[PDB]
């Protein structure tokens, strides 16, 4: 009875929301984002076991607005649906305030949307971890400074220097944390940062990945629009990970 609606158990936990965090683990897809000095990556697993499935079509990472790229992890279709809420949100903002939604807000508005589903009974929490990435103009000098923001099905918004979400998110965070003690991680070039992300993807699942079995998102201070990275440029990072 505690378990099947969004109400507190005797120990003060909304069981439905612990059970949505399990729905992020279930598909066996792991994403890793990483902020560098001038850019953000989001690396996602992109596993198509069917030879007949068109690779092109199945994406984790959607554009939300030109400057903010998502990367949903969990029930794909719940992801798909949040992205639509996030676009609706970012268009609503663009109209009412006449500027692009700042990523920090977008994340925090999606935080409050996912909270509402943990409060009103009979809505299912979206079984997914939004990983919004984008440049955000610091109002001190004018510089574009890179950002990652995870929403999770609890409604917990947070910023991230780097982050993982999905199957092995514990072991992929363990790898990034151990590699935060060596380096600074915000004094890194886009290349170095990628090699750490794609090494965490590799360390976590336990296998060497192809440039086809991942898709990678990107925003830079130079090119603040959310780009998918071409499979050519990802292969120059997976060759550079296998070396060092």
């Amino acid at each position: 009875f505690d378990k099947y609606i969004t109400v507190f158990s005797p120990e003060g936990s909304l069981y439905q929301v612990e059970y949505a965090f399990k729905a992020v683990t279930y598909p066996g897809l792991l994403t890793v984002a990483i902020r560098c000095k001038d850019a953000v990556l989001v690396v996602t697993q992109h596993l198509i076991p069917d030879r007949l499935m068109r690779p092109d079509s199945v994406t984790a990472l959607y554009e939300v607005t030109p400057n903010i790229g998502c990367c949903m992890t969990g029930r794909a279709p719940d992801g798909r649906a949040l992205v639509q809420r996030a676009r609706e949100e970012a268009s609503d903002y663009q109209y009412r305030y006449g500027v692009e939604i700042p990523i920090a807000v977008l994340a925090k508005r999606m935080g409050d949307k996912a909270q509402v589903r943990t409060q009103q009974a009979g809505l299912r929490p979206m079984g997914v971890v939004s990983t919004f990435i984008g440049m955000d103009q610091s109002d001190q000098d004018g510089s574009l400074k890179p950002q990652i923001y995870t929403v999770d099905p609890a409604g917990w918004t947070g910023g991230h220097i780097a982050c993982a979400a999905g199957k092995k998110q514990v072991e992929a965070m363990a790898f990034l944390e151990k590699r935060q003690k060596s380096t600074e991680l915000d004094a890194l070039t886009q290349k170095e940062a990628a090699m750490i992300a794609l090494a965490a993807l590799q360390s976590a699942i336990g296998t060497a990945v192809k440039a086809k079995e991942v898709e990678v998102g990107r925003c830079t201070a130079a090119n603040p629009a959310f780009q998918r990275v071409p499979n050519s440029e990802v292969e120059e990072w997976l060759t550079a990970v296998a070396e060092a």
């Binding site: 554009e63 939300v64 607005t65 030109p66 639509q84 676009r87 268009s91 663009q94 109209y95 006449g98």
Partner: protein
């Protein structure tokens, strides 16, 4: 207000005066009447500044949402059919005379007049606003389709000038913008260097012989310009 799109082979040129009058006083001297909907699809705006700006933003917003979700460019058609629906729904409340021009890769250089009523007429070239009425004859005479990008700009400027030189409502700068495969080229011809104006035209140097001295002869000479003469 004077606005006009024309299509050349690759793309389009929009062009505009830059004057918004409250009738007889010039409120703003340097208004941008060319209003970006997408990267390559500008609309020109004649009539109530309020109403065209509100519609240009309302559409620029739907095209942004659209452009995101389809994960591709917007067809100019899409911009004009959105703009038609919004000009048509409110056709009684508003006073809006729009020209959506643009480039998409599918059709190339498209131009749609959306006048008051919320008609929507795909054309080779559209004229809008008070100062349109002057150009219609000027186009019928001097326009010659299949112009190069360079000529179409130099032409539209010449046009917007001939209009704003006769119309009171129209005047100031001649903003153009070229929308094609390449990156949008806006240029802003300031009045002091406009291609045509009545003031500098040698036709109108010699004054009308209205004043005319007290003479002993029906022979019209010139105006009286000194009290001594």
């Amino acid at each position: 207000t004077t606005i006009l799109a024309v299509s050349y082979n690759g793309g389009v040129v929009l062009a505009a005066d830059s004057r918004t009058s409250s009738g007889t006083y010039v409120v703003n001297r340097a208004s941008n009447k060319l209003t970006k909907l997408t990267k390559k699809i500008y609309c020109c705006r004649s009539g109530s500044a309020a109403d065209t700006q509100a519609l240009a933003e309302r559409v620029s917003n739907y095209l942004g949402s659209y452009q995101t979700d389809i994960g591709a460019g917007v067809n100019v058609a899409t911009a004009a059919n959105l703009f038609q629906k919004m000009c048509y729904m409110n056709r009684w409340n508003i006073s809006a005379g729009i020209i959506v021009a643009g480039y998409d890769p599918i059709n190339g250089g498209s131009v749609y007049s959306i006048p008051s009523g919320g008609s929507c007429v795909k054309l080779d070239y559209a004229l809008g606003g008070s100062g349109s009425i002057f150009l219609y004859s000027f186009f019928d005479a001097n326009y010659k389709p299949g112009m190069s990008k360079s000529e179409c700009v130099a032409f539209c400027q010449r046009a917007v000038a001939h209009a704003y030189s006769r119309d009171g409502s129209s005047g100031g700068l001649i903003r153009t913008i070229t929308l094609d495969a390449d990156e949008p080229e806006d240029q802003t011809i300031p009045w002091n260097r406009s291609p045509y104006c009545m003031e500098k035209d040698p036709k109108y140097v010699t004054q009308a012989t209205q004043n005319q001295p007290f003479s002993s002869s029906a022979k019209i000479t010139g105006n009286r310009m000194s009290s001594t003469g």
